[PDB]
Structure 1
Amino acid sequence: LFVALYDYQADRWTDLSFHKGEKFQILDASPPGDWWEARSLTTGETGYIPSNYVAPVDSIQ
């Protein structure tokens, strides 16, 4: 489980938009690149998110 540290608006249609605090389950992080495929626990949509915008839920205060 991961949490959005900041808001993000997608520029590519493969990517999710999200708001600070939204939670995700990571589906794929294997390929090189700054993006992980994730599923929003709020919306149920799947797409890429920037890995640096999120942190494990237990790695925040």
Structure 2
Amino acid sequence: GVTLFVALYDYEARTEDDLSFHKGEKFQIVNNTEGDWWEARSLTTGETGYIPSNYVAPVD
């Protein structure tokens, strides 16, 4: 199903393992079966790291 998500809000990373992003930035979800921090790849930067799951929603 849909594994592409979009940021609903801007986010500035605290720790090195988090991605910073802007509203509208898209992500390919790598793993969301762990906690509420999801592993994801930014479609803008190509980087992979962790994002707060309640900041994103599926693109469709």
TM-score by length of 2: 0.91
2:29 aligned with 1:29 = no
How many residue pairs get matched? 57
**Whole-angstrom CA distance in 2 between matches of 1:56 and 1:28:** 14
| Unmatched 5+ stretches in structure 1 | none
Q: Which residue does the alignment assign to 1:48?
A: 50
**What is the CA RMSD across the aligned residues, in angstroms?**
0.6
Cα deviation 1:3-39 (Å, max 9, x = unaligned)? 00000000011000000000000001121x2200000
Runs of 4+ in 1 over 3 A off after TM superposition: none
TM-score by length of 1: 0.90
| Unmatched 5+ stretches in structure 2 | none
Q: Percent identity?
A: 82
2:15 aligned with 1:12 = yes
Which is richer in helix? 1
